[model samples]
Target: YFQGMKFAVAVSGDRVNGPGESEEVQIYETDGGNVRLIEKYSNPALNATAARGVFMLKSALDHGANALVLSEIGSPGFNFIKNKMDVYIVPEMPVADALKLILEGKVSPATAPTHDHG
Candidate 1:
């Protein structure tokens, strides 16, 4: 599961959120108040499918991300990936503020989804 992991994590959103949603992603490393941001250009190779979740995941790893901070995950196979990385399931918030919450050490880990499937 060494595909990727380290000091950074990835977050998804379209600047802000509502009924609107986008694959638009941002990679970040906590370095105090203003964390370092990595802007990834669109990758046409990915899509909304769980596979794309992987593509994004790989991208996160490629850029040194060991964790993912996502509001809602489109990956049906999220279960498999959870073992390989730190997954944070939190309500979507502004990206900057989310980073602040993370950097401010307000986040605690939880067990994966409680649902079982075939």
Candidate 2:
């Protein structure tokens, strides 16, 4: 979408247990190129963060973007029902490679630790 590159954004869950289960934001760039990290956000509300990510992604898609990438994504902090979140537009690359790096422990999630007393 931005310079002939298709964009797709995704958010990973807070609990990092297994593949397609851990939390992370990813973008898949065609042409077998590199996968870039656009934005990585962490929170403590699964529904809230997921909804926000989906909304932002949809907005980007509306603008002709083919994909959206999110890195180090997680639930929001506890005790905050809602917070002001920022979105960033970073570099672009391949999705599979990024995912591989994450799966292989080559990369790490960009989020802070949360203490849930519940």
Candidate 3:
């Protein structure tokens, strides 16, 4: 049942990061009953005028992601992706640890944005 499900994770180094702070967005898929990294998308330069969340979400969708695993996200990012894909907030933690928790069904998608825009 875990097969074929893909999750896009926002990361800064080895830990999960918010979409706006992430340096890379990685695609992980549950294949052969185990989760594995399948792709990595480098974030483009972002500024005040850039829609960082939209860009990351589109990249994930393009890569066939069914959900997004993140530690935190601002209102702008959350609003854009709320109805489009699952957004799971597992808190800031190592990518490997987060994935383990996710696979073990220890987390659930958020019902609202995790943070307000600053």
> Which candidate, 1 or 2, has the higher TM-score?
1
Give a tens-digit lDDT track for model 1, residues 1-118.
Answer: 2222233333344332211133455666544555666555453224544455556556655666666665544433355456766766456677766656655667654365423343
Tens digit per residue, CA lDDT, model 2, 7-76: 4344444222211222443334443244554444432223344445344444444444443334423333
What is residue 107's positional error in candidate 1, in angstroms? 2.4
Best by lDDT: 3
Task: Give the distance in Å from residue 70's predicted Cα in candidate 1 to where it truly belongs.
Answer: 0.3
Candidate 3 achieves a global lDDT of 0.78
> What is the Å distance of residue 16 in model 2 from its true position?
12
Best candidate (score: TM-score):
3
Which residue pairs clash in candidate 3?
Answer: none
Compared to the true structure, candidate 1 yields what TM-score?
A: 0.61
lDDT of 2: 0.36
For model 3, residues 1-114, the per-residue Cα lDDT tens digits are 346888899888878987766888888888634778888877542442576776777677777898898887778777878888888898789988888877777787788887
Q: What is candidate 3's CA lDDT for residue 58?
A: 69
Q: Rank the candidates by lDDT, best first.
A: 3, 1, 2
Number of clashing pairs per prediction, in order: 1, 23, 0
Worst lDDT run of 10 residues, candidate 1, spans: 14-23
